[PDB]
Structure formats: structure tokens, C-alpha cells
Amino acid sequence: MLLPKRVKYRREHRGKMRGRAKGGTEVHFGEFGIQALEASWITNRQIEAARIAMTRYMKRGGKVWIKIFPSKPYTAKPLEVRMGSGKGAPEGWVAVVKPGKVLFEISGVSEEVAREALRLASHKLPIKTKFVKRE
Amino acid sequence: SFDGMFTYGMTHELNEKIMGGRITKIHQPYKHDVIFHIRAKGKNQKLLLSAHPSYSRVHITAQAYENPSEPPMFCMLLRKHIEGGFIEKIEQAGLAAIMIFHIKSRNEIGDETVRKLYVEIMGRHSNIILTDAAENVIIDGLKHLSPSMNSYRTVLPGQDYKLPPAQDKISPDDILRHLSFQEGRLDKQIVDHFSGVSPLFAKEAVHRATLPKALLALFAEVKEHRFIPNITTVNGKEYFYLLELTHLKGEARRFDSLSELLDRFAERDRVKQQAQDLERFVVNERKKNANKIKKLEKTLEYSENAKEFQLYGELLTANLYMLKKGDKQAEVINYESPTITIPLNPNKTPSENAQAYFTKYQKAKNSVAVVEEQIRLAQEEIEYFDQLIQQLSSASPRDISEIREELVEGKYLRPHNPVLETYESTSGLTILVGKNNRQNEYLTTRVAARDDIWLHTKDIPGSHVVIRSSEPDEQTIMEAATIAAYFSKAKDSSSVPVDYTKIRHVKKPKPGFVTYDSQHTVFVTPDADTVI
Amino acid sequence: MRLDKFLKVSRLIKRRTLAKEVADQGRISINGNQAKASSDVKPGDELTVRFGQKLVTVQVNELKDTTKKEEAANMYTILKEEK
RNA sequence: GGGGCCUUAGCUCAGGGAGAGCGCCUGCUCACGCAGGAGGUCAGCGGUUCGAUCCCGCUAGGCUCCACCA
RNA sequence: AAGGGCCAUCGCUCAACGGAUAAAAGCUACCCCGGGGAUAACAGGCUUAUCUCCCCCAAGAGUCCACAUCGACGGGGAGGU
RNA sequence: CUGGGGCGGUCGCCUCCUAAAAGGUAACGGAGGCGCCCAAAGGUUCCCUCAGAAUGGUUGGAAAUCAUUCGCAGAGUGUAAA
Numbered sequence: 001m002l003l004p005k006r007v008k009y010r011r012e013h014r015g016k017m018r019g020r021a022k023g024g025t026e027v028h029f030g031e032f033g034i035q036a037l038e039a040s041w042i043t044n045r046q047i048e049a050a051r052i053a054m055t056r057y058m059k060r061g062g063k064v065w066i067k068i069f070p071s072k073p074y075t076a077k078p079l080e081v082r083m084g085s086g087k088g089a090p091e092g093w094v095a096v097v098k099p100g101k102v103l104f105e106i107s108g109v110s111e112e113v114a115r116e117a118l119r120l121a122s123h124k125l126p127i128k129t130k131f132v133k134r135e
Numbered sequence: 136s137f138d139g140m141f142t143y144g145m146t147h148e149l150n151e152k153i154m155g156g157r158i159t160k161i162h163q164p165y166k167h168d169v170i171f172h173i174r175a176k177g178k179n180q181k182l183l184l185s186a187h188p189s190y191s192r193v194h195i196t197a198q199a200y201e202n203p204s205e206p207p208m209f210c211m212l213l214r215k216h217i218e219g220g221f222i223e224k225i226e227q228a229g230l231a232a233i234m235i236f237h238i239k240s241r242n243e244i245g246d247e248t249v250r251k252l253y254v255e256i257m258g259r260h261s262n263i264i265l266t267d268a269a270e271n272v273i274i275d276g277l278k279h280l281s282p283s284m285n286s287y288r289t290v291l292p293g294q295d296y297k298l299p300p301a302q303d304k305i306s307p308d309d310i311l312r313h314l315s316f317q318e319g320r321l322d323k324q325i326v327d328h329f330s331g332v333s334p335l336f337a338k339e340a341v342h343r344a345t346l347p348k349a350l351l352a353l354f355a356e357v358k359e360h361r362f363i364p365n366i367t368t369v370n371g372k373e374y375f376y377l378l379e380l381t382h383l384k385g386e387a388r389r390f391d392s393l394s395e396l397l398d399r400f401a402e403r404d405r406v407k408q409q410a411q412d413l414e415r416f417v418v419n420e421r422k423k424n425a426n427k428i429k430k431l432e433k434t435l436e437y438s439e440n441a442k443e444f445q446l447y448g449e450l451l452t453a454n455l456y457m458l459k460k461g462d463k464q465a466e467v468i469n470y471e472s473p474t475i476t477i478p479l480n481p482n483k484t485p486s487e488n489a490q491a492y493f494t495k496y497q498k499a500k501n502s503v504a505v506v507e508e509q510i511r512l513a514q515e516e517i518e519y520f521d522q523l524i525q526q527l528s529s530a531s532p533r534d535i536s537e538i539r540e541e542l543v544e545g546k547y548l549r550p551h552n553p554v555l556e557t558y559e560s561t562s563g564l565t566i567l568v569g570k571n572n573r574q575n576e577y578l579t580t581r582v583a584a585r586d587d588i589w590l591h592t593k594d595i596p597g598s599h600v601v602i603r604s605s606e607p608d609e610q611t612i613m614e615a616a617t618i619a620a621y622f623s624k625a626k627d628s629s630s631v632p633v634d635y636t637k638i639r640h641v642k643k644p645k646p647g648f649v650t651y652d653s654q655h656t657v658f659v660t661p662d663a664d665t666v667i
Numbered sequence: 668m669r670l671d672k673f674l675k676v677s678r679l680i681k682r683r684t685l686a687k688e689v690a691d692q693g694r695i696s697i698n699g700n701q702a703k704a705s706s707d708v709k710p711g712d713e714l715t716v717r718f719g720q721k722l723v724t725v726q727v728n729e730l731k732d733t734t735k736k737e738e739a740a741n742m743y744t745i746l747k748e749e750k
Numbered sequence: 751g752g753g754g755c756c757u758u759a760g761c762u763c764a765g766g767g768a769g770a771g772c773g774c775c776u777g778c779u780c781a782c783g784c785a786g787g788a789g790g791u792c793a794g795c796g797g798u799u800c801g802a803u804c805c806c807g808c809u810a811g812g813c814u815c816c817a818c819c820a
Numbered sequence: 821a822a823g824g825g826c827c828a829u830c831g832c833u834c835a836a837c838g839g840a841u842a843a844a845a846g847c848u849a850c851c852c853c854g855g856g857g858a859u860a861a862c863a864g865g866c867u868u869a870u871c872u873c874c875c876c877c878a879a880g881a882g883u884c885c886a887c888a889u890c891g892a893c894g895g896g897g898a899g900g901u
Numbered sequence: 902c903u904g905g906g907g908c909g910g911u912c913g914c915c916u917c918c919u920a921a922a923a924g925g926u927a928a929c930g931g932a933g934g935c936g937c938c939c940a941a942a943g944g945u946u947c948c949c950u951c952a953g954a955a956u957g958g959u960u961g962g963a964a965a966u967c968a969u970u971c972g973c974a975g976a977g978u979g980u981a982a983a
Contacts, residue, residue, distance in 0.1 A: 123877035
């Protein structure tokens with residue numbers, strides 16, 4: 001459950017996930033990676049689920065290199081409450097994702113193993129994905 | 136001990152040295168303790184004063200203990216008005232447990248001035264005061280005392296000094312005149328007639344059995360300075376006085392100087408409090424671990440059916456061809472050719488049943504392994520704390536300070552080269568030791584070689600000590616055994632064997648779990664401070 | 668302030684419980700009047716007290732709660748003792 | 751759930767450069783009193799300032815008060 | 821002359837800070853009038869966070885064996901009680 | 902005022918974001934400050950240039966005051982921010 005240690009503002013606007021990514025569109029730390037085909041917010045619980053999933057499938061395998069970090073916080077008012085009276089309290093932390101963006105990489109491991117692990121992770125994630133490799 | 140008699144003896148016998156002693160330096164090492172490095176009779180000497188209630192006294196010490204890094208208020212006030220002084224005269228305050236120094240010194244303009252330093256040693260309410268000569272006004276005071284105690288006298292500066300109410304006691308037959316000897320328990324009421332009295336002195340004199348003779352003789356003795364400064368030890372409870380011991384069974388050690396007597400006899404007791412408070416906790420933990428393993432052991436005696444199931448599975452796999460599925464029992468022979476009747480599940484196959492026996496064997500095996508590991512843990516801890524208590528028994532504060540941090544590191548507690556301590560040894564040698572486990576290990580590893588010799592207990596628990604490259608004669612070999620038996624699990628045990636072994640076989644395997652080989656062992660016993 | 672609190676903060680009496688007890692016994696008085704633990708006090712007050720036969724007379728200078736040990740006695744002055 | 755107050759020695763609790771009393775240890779003194787030492791995150795986190803019990807914010811606990819009209 | 825005017829200046833957390841008076845708190849279930857669906861309680865409606873139900877990946881449990889039956893961390897939907 | 906009212910909270914002014922590249926722009930939207938201070942902390946003339954680093958080193962230490970090169974600026978600008 002990743003966390004930014006320190007932040008300026010505990011409360012931010014949400015934003016808009018228009019367009020494609022700026023960077024991180026291609027694997028370069030590792031060999032076999034995964035990228036997105038949509039745009040969405042992703043949570044520390046999602047990423048750690050995917051991470052531990054692939055690492056359990058691999059059991060010693062090489063290196064991973066996540067390519068993101070949930071910097072963004074997201075609020076949520078308490079339950080059964082009218083509107084207004086200030087912005088809701090923070091709940092967790094979020095990473096924002098554009099399409100064309102690489103999320104997880106892999107090295108030290110064969111292609112079939114990598115593809116299967118990333119499949120497993122994709123099923124923990126909400127969005128549509130693609131298997132990718134380095135050029 | 137510190138009677139008016141001892142006082143008066145000191146009054147003359149220190150004026151013997153310090154006529155006009157030039158006060159070269161002043162310090163206040165501890166709270167109720169003050170040092171003067173004085174220059175008298177063409178020599179430098181130390182002068183300790185103490186208003187520390189139980190240990191309040193005066194002394195001259197070869198051991199200039201430690202001048203502080205902080206000059207306290209009282210010390211600096213003494214520096215203000217006494218520094219570079221001149222000890223004109225000493226006085227006894229009329230044999231009460233009180234002393235006076237008549238002192239001279241030049242003021243800030245070189246004009247000569249005088250003062251009267253008073254040292255009242257009353258017991259729990261001793262004090263040190265400084266006063267003007269002519270005005271008798273107090274200038275300084277160690278224990279300021281407000282008249283809220285509704286007392287006769289007062290301490291505070293500026294005020295005219297006053298002495299305590301001197302009681303109606305003839306300070307030096309007269310007791311047979313005034314006091315009715317029928318009263319009994321007169322060791323009490325000699326205090327009611329004389330000024331300088333201890334109940335110790337009174338009892339030891341009353342036990343001389345009408346005895347005015349003893350009083351007069353001992354008073355003449357003291358007046359003549361005919362005493363013998365010794366320390367008495369009645370089964371511990373080490374006492375001392377001008378006169379020797381009179382009757383009791385206690386051991387006696389004599390001295391040439393009352394000052395050296397005081398030396399060899401404010402913070403020691405504090406360290407003792409800390410040590411005991413820690414020792415309680417350590418013993419609680421060790422006792423707890425011992426009872427913990429007792430629980431585990433007496434629990435272990437009720438699930439031990441492993442081997443039966445093992446042997447049953449063996450036999451069933453051996454006889455997996457005579458056996459129906461649906462049967463209750465099996466008359467079976469062991470591979471000694473007994474004939475065992477193993478029960479079955481009449482629903483299961485013999486394969487299933489035998490596999491279940493193997494499963495139960497596996498499970499009991501697992502649980503026993505768990506309990507044995509917990510046993511190993513607890514016993515390691517108990518031995519660690521037992522060695523620790525041995526060290527704490529044979530400890531010094533310098534190693535206790537390290538032991539505390541060791542335990543805080545072990546997280547039993549919460550909140551840099553000085554390692555070893557040594558004394559004399561045979562062959563004019565030096566034997567180093569450490570009551571702390573950590574310091575002992577530091578010495579054993581980093582302060583000697585492999586071919587050197589380590590000497591410790593040949594028994595359960597004791598300290599670790601050795602000389603630098605301990606290869607001296609059998610004299611030193613037997614002398615190390617005394618130091619070993621002194622700081623051991625059983626001090627003063629006259630049957631303690633010591634193990635001497637080459638450091639090359641010293642096993643550096645909890646902490647201080649040091650095994651040993653290349654060892655010999657010699658029966659020995661504890662000893663005295665001559666072991667130093 | 669109250670007499671029992673005052674006695675404690677001035678450290679005349681070591682326990683507020685004891686101050687209450689002795690004031691309920693009425694061993695003490697203020698300005699020649701018998702008093703109680705709830706009796707009010709102020710600067711310039713003249714207090715009479717007993718400890719068995721030991722009779723004591725004292726004068727009030729100040730009052731406070733935080734009362735560190737040596738500063739406690741600045742709060743008042745002893746005048747006199749009798750028996 | 752909201753608002754306010756508080757969280758400091760073992761307990762009770764005072765208070766922009768750590769205190770008391772109670773209880774422990776000690777001597778004095780059977781049983782109290784009287785003199786010393788110990789025990790301190792100033793609840794936690796973060797911030798301001800040279801510097802934080804103290805000033806600021808957030809969080810955890812406790813307590814008190816409110817939590818309503820259909 | 822009193823007094824007034826002009827000029828300079830003082831006096832208000834009038835802080836509910838364009839300040840109603842120099843001067844002011846509450847209960848009404850014993851209540852009343854004028855109006856409102858411009859605004860609340862029921863029901864209806866939109867939403868479906870929540871609720872219920874279904875499903876995906878599948879580690880793991882299941883002696884062995886993921887999918888007999890259960891199903892973690894996570895994910896996606898339906899319904900409109 | 903009020904996403905019914907009540908209770909809570911707020912009521913004036915300043916700075917930023919929201920604010921959509923002039924300006925302006927709401928919400929019980931997000932962050933913070935003011936109800937002053939200086940008789941020199943003003944005016945003028947003349948002067949010069951900071952923060953840190955390393956590195957030197959009696960005290961003095963992580964950390965004084967000292968000396969050296971590096972050093973658009975990491976400092977300062979009475980106070981909040983721009």
C-alpha cells in the first residue's frame with residue numbers, strides 16, 4: 001500500500017484523463033512489460049495486488065519495475081450526509097493513467113512466464129491492457 | 136561512629152598539618168561533598184567535607200575523587216570569599232559534632248579579611264555554613280533552612296549566625312552521682328549525660344561489666360589521642376570508631392590514619408538503588424521464563440503418541456494385503472516378535488488408515504518440534520539472565536551502565552572505549568576483568584590474542600577475566616582462580632572450580648553464550664580484597 | 668482560595684485530607700474566629716493553628732496553585748509559636 | 751456523528767528554557783513524622799521559531815454537552 | 821454674550837464590520853393569521869454511494885487436487901425491495 | 902446565510918488557486934493571513950552584495966567567531982501569500 005510520505009495539499013481536484021500519456025510509453029528498464037489501452041485511476045491496493053500476484057507466480061523472478069506511483073489523493077465524504085459543508089476527507093491514494101502508458105515491467109524471466117504474470121495482474125486491474133516488449 | 140570524640144581527635148590531628156594552610160583550589164564533586172586542594176606545611180593535600188546525611192563527615196583523602204566539570208553555586212561562592220585562603224586555626228565547637236575553621240584571605244582590594252567556616256555534622260540534618268568573624272552574619276549556606284520548621288536557629292545568608300541548642304549534657308563517677316544506675320539500659324542514657332556519644336560506643340562501654348572506670352579511662356584515652364583507628368565488621372554491618380571493638384565477634388582491621396580509615400570505609404547508595412531496581416526486573420524475567428518452560432514441560436506430557444502411530448503405519452504398509460476395507464482390528468506382528476492388535480476405521484481402507492497414522496505421527500512430530508524450539512529459546516534466555524545476574528553480582532557501575540544499554544538493545548528496557556577493569560596479580564602482573572557481559576566479550580576478543588589464556592568458572596555462571604597474554608606462572612594461575620571465585624554465581628563458595636583455557640578455543644558463538652575448549656580445570660575457592 | 672488548598676500549596680500540611688480533618692476538628696482559627704476547610708483566605712490574613720498543644724500564629728502574603736517546593740514558603744510568614 | 755476541555759513522574763495533578771502531593775528506595779525514626787535520590791515522549795505526527803509542555807495545524811484516546819420537529 | 825458655522829482633531833470590535841434604536845433574552849404541545857410545494861416528514865421520480873444478487877482472475881483451504889464445495893488481496897456488472 | 906429548519910460554522914479586509922492565457926466571475930470550494938509595526942525598519946547622499954558547501958582548523962561541539970575558493974541568488978526583502 002504505497003504512500004507519498006509528504007504532500008503540499010491533502011485535497012486536490014480530481015482532474016481529467018484526456019489524451020495519451022506523456023512518457024513511460026515503452027519498456028526500457030525491463031524486457032517484457034504491460035501497457036494500458038484506456039484511462040483510469042488506479043489505487044495502491046490494486047497495484048500491490050498485482051505486484052504480489054506476479055511475484056507469487058514468479059517466486060524468484062528477476063525484477064519488476066512498477067512505473068507509477070499513486071501521488072494523487074482522493075476524498076470521500078462520510079456516509080449518509082447531505083451535500084456541502086466543505087470538501088470530504090481524504091480516503092486513499094491514486095495514480096492517474098493515460099493510455100499508451102506502461103505500468104509494470106519484467107526482466108530476468110522468459111516471455112511466457114512474463115505474459116502469464118502480467119495476465120494475472122491485468123485481471124486484478126480494471127482496465128484493458130496489452131503485452132509489450134522492448135525494441 | 137562520628138562522635139564528638141572522633142571529631143575532637145580530628146580537630147587537633149589536622150591542625151597538626153594545616154596550620155595556616157593555603158587554600159589553593161576549591162571544588163564540589165558531588166551534591167553534599169566539597170574538596171579543597173590546600174597547600175600547608177610546604178605540601179599539597181586534599182580536604183573532603185561532607186554534609187551527606189548518613190555519610191556526613193570530614194576527611195583528607197589520597198583519592199582526589201573527581202573535580203566536576205560544572206562549578207556549582209556553592210563552590211563558586213566559596214571561591215569568592217575563601218580562595219587562596221589561610222587556615223589560621225581549627226576549633227571543635229565544644230566537642231559537639233561540629234567544627235570551625237578560622238580563615239584569613241585578602242579581599243578584592245588586597246585588604247586582609249577573615250571568616251568562620253562552620254561544619255555541623257548532626258546526622259540527617261547536617262549542614263555546612265560560612266559566617267563573618269565579627270558580625271557573625273551568615274554569608275553562604277549549603278542547606279538553607281527556613282524557620283517553617285519553627286526551629287531555634289536559621290541558615291539563610293545575611294542573618295546573624297546561630298548555633299544549635301547545646302543540650303544539658305556534661306560533654307566529658309558523675310554518672311553514678313546524677314544517674315540512678317538502677318534505671319538499666321544505660322547505654323541509652325549516657326547520651327543523656329555526655330555530648331559526644333554513639334549508641335555503639337555506649338553499648339560497647341556498658342558491656343564492660345557500676346562502671347565509671349570505663350568512661351574515665353576511655354575519655355583519658357581520647358584526650359591523649361591514645362585511640363586505634365580501625366574498622367569493625369560484626370557479620371557485615373561494618374562499623375568503625377576511634378577505639379577498637381570492645382566485645383563483639385566482629386572482625387577488625389586497623390589503620391595508621393583515621394583519614395585512611397574513612398577512605399577505605401552521596402552516590403554509591405543511589406547506584407545501589409538503581410542496581411537493585413534493575414536486578415528485581417531481571418530476576419522477574421528469568422523466574423518467568425523458568426516457570427514458562429515448566430508450563431511447557433508439564434503440558435508436553437500429554438501428547439506423545441508419535442511412535443505408536445509411526446510403527447502402526449509401518450506395520451500396516453507391511454500388511455496391506457491381508458486386510459479388508461471394512462474391519463475394526465488387525466492382529467499384527469512386530470518385526471522380539473510380539474503380536475499387536477491395531478484398531479481401524481471400519482469405513483476406511485487399510486491404505487487410508489495407515490496414511491492417517493502417518494498423518495498423526497507427522498502432526499505430533501511437528502508439535503513436539505515446536506515445543507522443543509520454545510524450550511530452547513526459553514532456556515537460552517534463562518541462561519543469559521543467569522550469567523547476567525552473576526555479572527550484576529560481581530559488577531561495577533562502569534559495566535552496569537553498559538549492561539543497561541545491552542538490555543535496552545534487547546528491548547527489555549528503554550533509555551565509548553572504556554572496557555576493562557583490573558587490579559594487582561601474582562608475578563607483579565595485571566589481570567583484567569569485566570562484570571558486564573559486553574565488556575567481558577570486548578576484552579576477550581579485542582584485548583587479547585588467540586594463544587593467550589582465559590580464566591573463568593568451570594561451572595554454571597561467573598565472570599570472565601584474564602591478563603594480557605595470560606601466560607604467567609602457576610602463582611598467577613591460582614591467583615586468577617580467586618578472582619574467578621569472587622565474582623561467581625556463588626560468591627564465598629569454598630569449593631568453586633575455575634577453568635583456564637587458551638583463548639584460541641574461546642567460542643564466540645544469546646550474547647555471552649561462550650563455550651570453551653583447550654581447557655583445564657582446578658578446584659579453588661573465593662578470597663578477599665587481597666585478590667586485587 | 669480555600670484553607671485546605673492553601674495549607675497544601677504552602678506545604679504547612681502535607682495532605683489536603685489532613686487539612687480537611689484538622690479543620691473539621693476545629694483545632695485552628697483565622698483572625699480569632701473558628702474556621703473550616705472551605706473558609707476563604709487572602710493576603711494580609713492572620714492565622715492561628717494547633718498541632719496538639721503546639722500553637723502557631725502566621726501571616727498570609729500571597730496565594731497560587733503551581734507552588735514549587737521552595738517558593739511555597741514565600742506565600743506566607745511565621746509570626747509566633749506557643750504551647 | 752458535531753462542539754468544547756484534557757492527555758506531563760507508578761497514581762492524582764499544577765506548570766517559549768520539568769514542578770507538587772501521593773506511593774517506592776534510604777537514613778533519621780514499634781508507628782508516624784522529617785531529609786535525600788529514582789521514576790519525565792510533556793498522547794502521536796507535522797509545522798513555525800535559534801529554541802517548543804507552552805505557539806500553530808492534523809491525528810488517537812478520555813470526558814462533558816448536543817444529537818431535535820415531523 | 822450664550823450658541824452656532826468653517827478649519828484641524830478626538831471619542832464605536834456599531835465584529836451581524838454600508839452600521840435599523842443610546843437602550844433589549846426565551847417557551848408555546850393551549851395557539852392564531854397570511855403565504856408556499858419558491859422549502860422539510862410519507863409515497864412517487866433521477867441517481868444507486870449504501871443494500872441485495874450475479875460474475876471475472878485465482879492464490880490458497882480442500883490429505884494429494886484451484887474450480888465437489890469454499891474463495892483471500894483485487895476487479896466488473898444487474899436490480900431498484 | 903443555510904442543498905428544509907434548528908444546533909454547529911461564518912458575517913468586514915488582504916494574498917493565491919479554482920479563473921477556462923485581458924479584466925471580471927460563484928459555492929457551507931481549497932490554503933493562509935489583518936484589526937499592526939519602525940522616530941528608524943522613513944527621506945537623501947555615499948558605500949557593497951547574500952544563502953549553503955567543502956576546506957582550515959586550540960576552546961568550539963553536528964552546530965559559534967574566524968580564513969580560502971566554489972559560488973544569479975538556494976539568502977534577504979518588519980509581517981501571510983503572490
